[PDB]
A paper describes a structure:
[name] FD-1 is a gram-positive cellulosome-producing anaerobic bacterium that possesses the most elaborate cellulosome system thus far discovered in nature. The parent protein, RflaF_05439 (accession number: ZP_06142651), consists of a tandem repeat of two conserved modules at the N terminus and a C-terminal XDoc, which also binds to ScaE-Coh (unpublished results). In silico analysis of the structure implied that the protein belongs to an established superfamily of cysteine-like peptidases, termed NlpC/P60, and this domain will hereafter be coined [name]. The NlpC/P60 superfamily of peptidases is characterized by a conserved catalytic triad, which contains cysteine, histidine and a polar residue (i.e., glutamine, aspargine, histidine, glutamate or aspartate) within a catalytic core.
The X-ray crystal structure of the second module of the tandem repeat of RflaF_05439 from [name] FD-1 was determined at a resolution of 1.38 Å. There are no significant differences between the two molecules in the asymmetric unit (RMSD of 0.06 Å for all Cα atoms). The overall fold consists of two globular domains that form a tight interface: an N-terminal α-helical domain and a C-terminal domain comprised of 6 antiparallel βstrands covered by short α-helices and loops. The potential active site of [name] is located in the channel groove that runs along the interface between the N-and C-terminal domains. The crystal structure of the protein module described in this work allows the assignment of a putative function for the RflaF_05439 protein, which is identified to be a member of the NlpC/P60 superfamily, possessing the characteristic conserved catalytic triad residues (Cys109/His215/Gln230). A fourth residue, Tyr71, is also conserved. This residue is important for formation of a putative oxyanion hole, which helps stabilize transitional forms between the peptidase and the substrate. In the [name] structure, extra electron density was discovered contiguous with the side chain of the catalytic cysteine, Cys109. This extraneous electron density was modeled as acetate. In any case, is it likely that the modified cysteine would lead to an inactivated enzyme, which may explain why attempts to demonstrate protease activity were unsuccessful.
Author numbering: 23 to 268
Protein backbone atom coordinates (compact mmCIF):
# COMPACT_ATOMS: atom_id res chain seq x y z
CA UNK A 1 0.00 0.00 0.00
CA UNK A 2 1.01 3.65 -0.42
CA UNK A 3 3.07 4.86 2.54
CA UNK A 4 2.08 8.29 3.90
CA UNK A 5 5.08 10.48 4.77
CA UNK A 6 4.82 12.79 7.79
CA UNK A 7 2.15 10.37 8.97
CA UNK A 8 1.93 11.97 12.44
CA UNK A 9 1.53 15.52 11.12
CA UNK A 10 -1.37 17.40 9.62
CA UNK A 11 -3.58 17.47 6.53
CA UNK A 12 -3.68 20.54 4.33
CA UNK A 13 -7.05 21.66 5.68
CA UNK A 14 -5.81 21.34 9.25
CA UNK A 15 -2.66 23.29 8.42
CA UNK A 16 -4.65 26.10 6.81
CA UNK A 17 -6.90 26.17 9.86
CA UNK A 18 -3.80 26.57 12.08
CA UNK A 19 -2.24 29.20 9.81
CA UNK A 20 -5.53 31.11 9.96
CA UNK A 21 -5.43 31.13 13.77
CA UNK A 22 -8.66 29.10 13.69
CA UNK A 23 -10.54 31.70 11.66
CA UNK A 24 -10.99 29.37 8.66
CA UNK A 25 -12.42 25.87 9.04
CA UNK A 26 -11.14 24.57 5.68
CA UNK A 27 -13.87 21.91 5.70
CA UNK A 28 -13.46 19.24 2.99
CA UNK A 29 -17.10 19.14 1.97
CA UNK A 30 -17.29 22.89 1.52
CA UNK A 31 -14.05 22.85 -0.47
CA UNK A 32 -15.45 20.11 -2.72
CA UNK A 33 -18.66 22.08 -3.23
CA UNK A 34 -16.60 25.19 -4.07
CA UNK A 35 -14.60 23.20 -6.61
CA UNK A 36 -17.79 21.90 -8.24
CA UNK A 37 -19.24 25.42 -8.42
CA UNK A 38 -16.15 27.37 -9.47
CA UNK A 39 -15.06 24.89 -12.13
CA UNK A 40 -18.48 25.29 -13.74
CA UNK A 41 -19.10 29.04 -13.54
CA UNK A 42 -17.17 31.72 -15.44
CA UNK A 43 -14.93 32.88 -12.59
CA UNK A 44 -11.81 30.88 -13.51
CA UNK A 45 -12.43 28.97 -16.74
CA UNK A 46 -11.15 30.88 -19.75
CA UNK A 47 -8.59 32.92 -17.82
CA UNK A 48 -5.41 32.93 -19.90
CA UNK A 49 -2.44 30.91 -18.66
CA UNK A 50 0.53 33.27 -18.69
CA UNK A 51 4.25 32.83 -17.99
CA UNK A 52 4.70 35.09 -14.97
CA UNK A 53 5.08 33.18 -11.74
CA UNK A 54 3.14 35.80 -9.73
CA UNK A 55 0.07 35.84 -12.01
CA UNK A 56 -2.94 35.29 -9.74
CA UNK A 57 -5.79 37.28 -11.36
CA UNK A 58 -8.69 35.15 -12.59
CA UNK A 59 -11.45 36.51 -14.81
CA UNK A 60 -13.58 36.87 -11.68
CA UNK A 61 -10.93 38.94 -9.81
CA UNK A 62 -8.63 40.73 -12.26
CA UNK A 63 -6.85 42.52 -9.45
CA UNK A 64 -3.31 42.70 -10.81
CA UNK A 65 -4.59 44.60 -13.85
CA UNK A 66 -5.32 47.56 -11.56
CA UNK A 67 -1.95 47.90 -9.83
CA UNK A 68 1.61 48.39 -11.06
CA UNK A 69 1.81 44.63 -11.80
CA UNK A 70 -0.20 45.28 -14.96
CA UNK A 71 2.99 45.80 -16.95
CA UNK A 72 4.34 42.33 -16.21
CA UNK A 73 0.90 40.83 -16.76
CA UNK A 74 0.55 42.40 -20.21
CA UNK A 75 3.98 41.28 -21.42
CA UNK A 76 3.12 37.62 -21.11
CA UNK A 77 -0.46 37.79 -22.36
CA UNK A 78 -2.59 38.91 -19.46
CA UNK A 79 -5.59 40.99 -20.56
CA UNK A 80 -7.77 43.68 -19.02
CA UNK A 81 -10.79 41.62 -20.03
CA UNK A 82 -9.79 38.24 -18.57
CA UNK A 83 -6.77 38.71 -16.34
CA UNK A 84 -4.14 35.99 -16.23
CA UNK A 85 -2.96 33.07 -14.11
CA UNK A 86 0.11 30.94 -13.62
CA UNK A 87 -0.03 27.56 -11.95
CA UNK A 88 0.75 28.38 -8.28
CA UNK A 89 -1.08 31.66 -8.55
CA UNK A 90 -4.19 29.81 -9.63
CA UNK A 91 -4.05 27.26 -6.82
CA UNK A 92 -3.36 30.06 -4.32
CA UNK A 93 -6.30 32.08 -5.53
CA UNK A 94 -8.67 29.10 -5.70
CA UNK A 95 -7.87 27.99 -2.16
CA UNK A 96 -8.03 31.57 -0.82
CA UNK A 97 -11.30 32.21 -2.61
CA UNK A 98 -12.77 28.98 -1.27
CA UNK A 99 -11.76 30.00 2.25
CA UNK A 100 -13.34 33.42 1.70
CA UNK A 101 -16.60 31.86 0.48
CA UNK A 102 -16.66 29.47 3.48
CA UNK A 103 -15.74 32.02 6.18
CA UNK A 104 -17.14 35.30 4.90
CA UNK A 105 -13.68 36.88 5.27
CA UNK A 106 -12.19 38.95 2.45
CA UNK A 107 -9.89 37.08 0.10
CA UNK A 108 -7.18 39.62 0.95
CA UNK A 109 -7.19 38.13 4.45
CA UNK A 110 -7.61 34.45 3.58
CA UNK A 111 -4.79 34.54 1.01
CA UNK A 112 -2.43 35.08 3.94
CA UNK A 113 -3.22 31.53 5.10
CA UNK A 114 -2.33 29.83 1.81
CA UNK A 115 1.15 29.19 0.39
CA UNK A 116 2.23 30.60 -2.96
CA UNK A 117 5.80 31.77 -3.46
CA UNK A 118 8.29 32.91 -0.87
CA UNK A 119 8.88 35.99 -3.07
CA UNK A 120 5.31 37.11 -3.72
CA UNK A 121 5.11 39.24 -0.56
CA UNK A 122 8.44 40.92 -1.32
CA UNK A 123 7.16 41.77 -4.78
CA UNK A 124 5.15 44.59 -3.24
CA UNK A 125 1.55 44.13 -4.36
CA UNK A 126 -1.59 44.80 -2.31
CA UNK A 127 -2.18 41.15 -1.44
CA UNK A 128 0.02 38.81 0.56
CA UNK A 129 0.38 35.05 0.83
CA UNK A 130 1.38 32.79 3.70
CA UNK A 131 4.81 33.17 5.28
CA UNK A 132 6.41 31.81 8.43
CA UNK A 133 6.99 34.27 11.27
CA UNK A 134 10.62 34.20 10.16
CA UNK A 135 9.62 35.38 6.67
CA UNK A 136 10.00 32.17 4.62
CA UNK A 137 7.29 30.87 2.32
CA UNK A 138 6.25 28.61 -0.52
CA UNK A 139 5.03 25.06 -0.69
CA UNK A 140 7.93 22.99 0.62
CA UNK A 141 8.38 25.44 3.50
CA UNK A 142 4.67 25.01 4.26
CA UNK A 143 4.98 21.21 4.11
CA UNK A 144 7.91 21.26 6.54
CA UNK A 145 6.42 23.90 8.83
CA UNK A 146 3.12 22.07 9.31
CA UNK A 147 4.54 18.54 8.93
CA UNK A 148 2.04 17.96 6.15
CA UNK A 149 1.03 14.44 5.29
CA UNK A 150 2.10 13.57 1.76
CA UNK A 151 2.37 10.74 -0.71
CA UNK A 152 4.97 10.31 -3.47
CA UNK A 153 4.29 8.31 -6.63
CA UNK A 154 6.77 7.44 -9.34
CA UNK A 155 4.01 7.03 -11.95
CA UNK A 156 0.57 8.39 -12.60
CA UNK A 157 -0.76 4.82 -12.79
CA UNK A 158 0.53 4.08 -9.27
CA UNK A 159 -1.05 7.33 -7.97
CA UNK A 160 -4.43 6.67 -9.59
CA UNK A 161 -4.56 3.03 -8.42
CA UNK A 162 -3.45 3.76 -4.84
CA UNK A 163 -6.89 4.53 -3.41
CA UNK A 164 -5.59 7.66 -1.73
CA UNK A 165 -6.89 10.55 -3.81
CA UNK A 166 -9.99 12.60 -3.02
CA UNK A 167 -11.41 15.64 -4.80
CA UNK A 168 -9.71 18.67 -3.27
CA UNK A 169 -6.28 17.13 -2.74
CA UNK A 170 -3.32 19.12 -4.02
CA UNK A 171 -1.10 17.42 -6.60
CA UNK A 172 2.40 18.46 -7.61
CA UNK A 173 3.91 17.22 -10.85
CA UNK A 174 7.64 17.13 -10.21
CA UNK A 175 9.91 17.91 -13.16
CA UNK A 176 11.99 14.81 -13.79
CA UNK A 177 14.80 16.96 -15.20
CA UNK A 178 15.67 18.00 -11.62
CA UNK A 179 14.51 15.13 -9.42
CA UNK A 180 11.89 12.66 -8.21
CA UNK A 181 9.15 13.18 -5.66
CA UNK A 182 9.50 15.60 -2.78
CA UNK A 183 13.28 15.95 -3.14
CA UNK A 184 12.74 17.12 -6.72
CA UNK A 185 10.14 19.64 -5.59
CA UNK A 186 12.67 21.16 -3.20
CA UNK A 187 14.89 21.96 -6.15
CA UNK A 188 14.43 25.12 -8.19
CA UNK A 189 13.14 24.03 -11.59
CA UNK A 190 11.64 25.40 -14.78
CA UNK A 191 8.54 23.24 -14.91
CA UNK A 192 7.16 21.81 -11.67
CA UNK A 193 3.35 22.04 -11.89
CA UNK A 194 0.55 22.16 -9.32
CA UNK A 195 -3.21 21.59 -9.45
CA UNK A 196 -6.24 20.47 -7.46
CA UNK A 197 -7.56 16.93 -7.92
CA UNK A 198 -11.12 16.80 -9.22
CA UNK A 199 -11.54 13.10 -9.97
CA UNK A 200 -13.30 10.22 -8.26
CA UNK A 201 -10.23 8.57 -6.75
CA UNK A 202 -9.08 6.74 -9.83
CA UNK A 203 -10.02 9.06 -12.70
CA UNK A 204 -7.39 11.34 -14.24
CA UNK A 205 -8.80 14.80 -13.59
CA UNK A 206 -7.58 18.00 -11.98
CA UNK A 207 -8.16 21.74 -11.92
CA UNK A 208 -5.20 23.84 -12.97
CA UNK A 209 -3.84 26.69 -15.02
CA UNK A 210 -1.28 25.40 -17.48
CA UNK A 211 -1.13 22.49 -19.94
CA UNK A 212 -4.54 21.13 -20.96
CA UNK A 213 -3.50 18.80 -23.80
CA UNK A 214 -0.35 16.80 -23.02
CA UNK A 215 2.62 16.43 -20.68
CA UNK A 216 5.24 19.00 -21.64
CA UNK A 217 2.99 20.94 -24.02
CA UNK A 218 3.04 24.61 -23.02
CA UNK A 219 1.45 25.76 -26.27
CA UNK A 220 -1.99 24.36 -25.52
CA UNK A 221 -2.70 25.89 -22.13
CA UNK A 222 -5.60 27.26 -20.16
CA UNK A 223 -7.42 27.39 -16.85
CA UNK A 224 -9.73 24.40 -16.71
CA UNK A 225 -10.36 20.86 -15.59
CA UNK A 226 -8.28 18.38 -17.60
CA UNK A 227 -6.14 15.29 -17.16
CA UNK A 228 -3.12 15.58 -14.88
CA UNK A 229 -0.51 16.80 -17.38
CA UNK A 230 2.83 18.14 -16.24
CA UNK A 231 4.54 21.20 -17.66
CA UNK A 232 7.62 18.98 -17.76
CA UNK A 233 8.05 16.15 -20.27
CA UNK A 234 8.82 13.73 -17.44
CA UNK A 235 7.03 13.75 -14.10
CA UNK A 236 6.65 12.08 -10.78
CA UNK A 237 3.95 13.10 -8.33
CA UNK A 238 3.50 14.44 -4.82
CA UNK A 239 0.03 14.44 -3.27
CA UNK A 240 -0.89 16.71 -0.36
CA UNK A 241 -4.22 15.37 0.90
CA UNK A 242 -6.74 17.95 2.03
CA UNK A 243 -8.27 15.77 4.72
CA UNK A 244 -8.47 12.19 5.93
CA UNK A 245 -10.14 9.93 3.36
CA UNK A 246 -13.58 8.41 3.95
Amino acid sequence: MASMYNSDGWYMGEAINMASLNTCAADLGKWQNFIDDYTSNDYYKGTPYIDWVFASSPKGDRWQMNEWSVSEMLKVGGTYEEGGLNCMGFVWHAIAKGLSVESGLDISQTGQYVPFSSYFNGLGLSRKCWATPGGSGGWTVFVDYYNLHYYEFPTKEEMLSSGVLQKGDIIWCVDGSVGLGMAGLRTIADNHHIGIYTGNGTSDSWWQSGPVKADGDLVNVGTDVCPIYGAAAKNTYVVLPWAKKA
